[PDB]
């Protein structure tokens, strides 16, 4: 049996936002689970969550 | 100061001190909720509001 596709209609979409201050960061994004995202940029940027 | 007001005709010193009794409250009982709201994230760090 072979795979698939999602071909959901809007595509990734997103925007990082820096602050200018305490290197707060917003991120926009399209996302199904916030808490990754939140996650993986706080280990990028190495700052606590 | 009393020695110096009588050798000193236009030139003149003063003392003065006050008490203070400050009272602090409000209207109505209504007039003193207060609320706030607090976050713990997976690494240890908070947020507050």
């Given at each position: ?6 071909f959901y209609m809007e595509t990734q979409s997103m925007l990082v936002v820096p602050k200018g201050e305490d290197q707060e960061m917003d991120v926009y994004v399209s996302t199904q689970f ?16 | ?49």
């Open positions: 049996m072979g795979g698939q596709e999602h916030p808490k990754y995202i939140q996650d993986i940029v706080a280990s990028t940027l190495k700052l606590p969550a | 100061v009393e020695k110096f007001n009588a050798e000193n005709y236009w030139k003149k010193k003063g003392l003065a001190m006050v008490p203070l009794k400050f009272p602090v409250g409000l209207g109505s009982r209504a007039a003193g909720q207060a609320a706030a709201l607090v976050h713990i994230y997976l690494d240890g760090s908070v947020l507050v509001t």
